[PDB]
Design a binder for these strands. Structure first.
Lengths: 158, 129, 125, 54
RNA sequence: AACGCAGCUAGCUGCGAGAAUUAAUGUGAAUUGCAGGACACAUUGAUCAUCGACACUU
RNA sequence: CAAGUCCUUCUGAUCGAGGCCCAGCCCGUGGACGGUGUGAGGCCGGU
RNA sequence: UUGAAAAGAACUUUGAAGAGAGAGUUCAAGAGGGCGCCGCCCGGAGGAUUCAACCCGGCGGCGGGUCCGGCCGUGUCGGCGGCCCGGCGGAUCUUUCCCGC
RNA sequence: GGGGACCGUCCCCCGACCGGCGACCGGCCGCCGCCGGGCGCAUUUCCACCGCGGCGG
């Protein structure tokens, strides 16, 4: 049983024209499906990020062996500067390579079944027809009439 | 919202061009609004500052009703100098205080050949609208 | 439907406050301002709410009209009460018990009214 | 009752629960007559007073 | 790659004995740390940008 | 090439806080951004 | 990575100076140049838009066989409206009426 | 390759049948409640204070 809602003129009052409620507004409301679709779809507009694959690797460092009373971490060859003798190539070393460097080919995007994607749209539209849910979103609709709000086509020409 | 794909809205990019700007560009940002009387008569809202214009301070500690003339347009520090905008140095001398052009009002313009042409060009663009 | 709507705003609502191991809900006409299916002023076909008047004299009793469920502009009719405190509770009690209009907030409505009247009289030092 | 005209294969999803009103269903004579009486009495732990002394 | 070029100038930067720039065009009153030099601003011009003319040491 | 540096008030300075006949200051095909003595659609460049 | 702005500490005094003590700038030097007892009852003395019940008006809630419309879920009626009164499909028939050999 | 018929489906009128006004709405009578204004101005009602007051928390 779909009621008969009225359309409103640009002055804010009903113009006498009525539209029967489309059946999509009585579709099941499934916030779990909407959340699942929204979570996966929102990943598709991201841009890839990654560190430089050369980062921390242009040093040519050696491990110094074990006969000297230091750690076996690779250390920069050379001398006469601060960088000489310092640890490198490790995630625990200052200026080293981070553990498991991020790669651009991480699976950024997700694909969702067309039926499930469209299902969420019907559930979202149906939930938009209940004033209690709209107030629960904080949309401050207490003085608007006919919560599913339809206005005349003259608005399209503004 | 900006729709031009070739104009950036990046914070660092916009700041870099503003801080590293040639003087002839810097003159354009060196712009000040005209008072209501010039604005009504010239039909122009804002004009680039010049060396000798009657200028009134409307913001800051030196805000007031008095009229002064620019004496120096220091484009490097994005400031200008008026006569009576001064403070007392420690030893005894007197130094000017840099005021940003956007915080003043032009009360009289350095009416000049290039200047006179500049107002009517901006003004005639108003009757277009 | 009230039950169907409740399962949606049960844990996700702009009126929900979760803090200090307590939960509160701040929709306009909610007695006790608590998160419960019973005390929710949005998802029921009929609701009862009392608020202080526009000025600091009396209470405003608002109940939900039966017909305009999808027309929030005319969904709620408000009445103001500015009689004696005892008269107020007697008047409010009749709106619920005699009309059989949700006879489960009757005790709650009187409690909120009595609290509101206390706030309108001056406080001694 | 009719399929979508601009998607070429879509018909609206169906409902797993036609009447989502528990209060309407539960407090109805068909269901009520089939229920047993509620046990609202609360039986708390009984302090075992000792015989041979009481 | 080297060496030179600023009134006061080491580096950076720019430049090439026309050497922190010449010419031309656009713009239109500054540069600036100091001083000096400027500046009818068309009886036509500081600065900046552009850059097609000229020049460009080993 | 649009429109507030309007009035009262916070401050060292404010772009801050209130008000703005007509259901509502002004522009909005412009409420991106940056600068400006906090935090600015309407001061400036822009958009 | 001072400070909004050098406004970067005049001047007096000790020290040969480095360094201090006063003073001064700034909102800030704690930013000084590698510086970010309450509900009911009793009694008394008081005051006051006042009580109930009636009258008018407005607004709600519940009920009405269907009081009346407007309807909703149906099966069911002329085949009633169809592809030039006016859909969508069919691996159903065909032109024994049509535009290709 | 056309156009028709048929079948299945919706979209429509037009009736008649049952069920229900449902949580899709109005008008009317009924009952109840509230509000505003009159009348009701006094053993009623209400407000505030006092008592080393009585009851329950």
């Amino acid at each position: 049983a779909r009621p008969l809602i009225s359309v409103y003129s640009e002055k804010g009052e009903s113009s006498g024209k009525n539209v029967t409620l489309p059946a999509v507004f009585k579709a099941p409301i499934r916030p779990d499906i909407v959340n699942f679709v929204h979570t996966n779809l929102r990943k598709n507009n991201r841009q890839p990020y990654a560190v430089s694959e050369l980062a921390g690797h242009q040093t040519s460092a050696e491990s110094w062996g074990t006969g000297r009373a230091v750690a076996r971490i690779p250390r920069v060859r050379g001398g006469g500067t601060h960088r000489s003798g310092q640890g490198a190539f490790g995630n625990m070393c200052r200026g080293g390579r981070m553990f498991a460097p991020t790669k651009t080919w991480r699976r950024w995007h997700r694909r969702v079944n067309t039926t499930q994607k469209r299902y969420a749209i019907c559930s979202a539209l149906a939930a938009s027809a209940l004033p209690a849910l709209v107030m629960s979103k904080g949309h401050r609709i207490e003085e608007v009439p006919e919560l599913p709000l339809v206005v005349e086509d003259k608005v399209e020409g503004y | 919202m900006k729709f031009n794909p070739f104009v950036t809205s990046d914070r660092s990019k916009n700041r870099k061009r503003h801080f590293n700007a040639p003087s002839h560009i810097r003159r354009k940002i060196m712009s000040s609004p005209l008072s209501k009387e010039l604005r009504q008569k010239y039909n122009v809202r804002s004009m680039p500052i010049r060396k000798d214009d009657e200028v009134q301070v409307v913001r800051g500690h030196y805000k007031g009703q008095q009229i002064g003339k620019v004496v120096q347009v220091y484009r490097k520090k994005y400031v200008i100098y008026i006569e009576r905008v001064q403070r007392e140095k420690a030893n005894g001398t007197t130094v000017h205080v840099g005021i940003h052009p956007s915080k003043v009002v032009i009360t009289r313009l350095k009416l000049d050949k290039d200047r006179k042409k500049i107002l009517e060009r901006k003004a005639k663009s108003r009757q277009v609208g | 439907s009230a039950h169907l709507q409740w399962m949606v705003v049960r844990n996700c609502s702009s009126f929900l406050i979760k803090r200090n191991k307590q939960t509160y809900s701040t929709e306009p006409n909610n007695l006790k301002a608590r998160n419960s299916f019973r005390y929710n002023g949005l998802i029921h076909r009929k609701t009862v709410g009392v608020e202080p008047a526009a000025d600091g004299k009396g209470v405003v009793v608002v109940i939900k009209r039966r017909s305009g469920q999808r027309k929030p502009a005319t969904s709620y009719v408000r009445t103001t009460i500015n009689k004696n405190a005892r008269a107020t509770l007697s008047s409010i009690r009749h709106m619920i018990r005699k009309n059989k209009y949700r006879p489960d907030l009757r005790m709650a409505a009187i409690r909120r009214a009595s609290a509101i009247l206390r706030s309108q009289k001056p406080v001694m030092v | 009752r009719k399929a979508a005209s601009l998607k070429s294969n879509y018909n609206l999803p169906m409902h797993k629960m036609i009447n989502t009103d528990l209060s309407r269903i539960l407090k109805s004579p068909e269901i009520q007559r089939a229920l047993r009486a509620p046990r609202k009495k609360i039986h708390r732990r009984v302090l075992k007073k000792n015989p041979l002394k009481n």
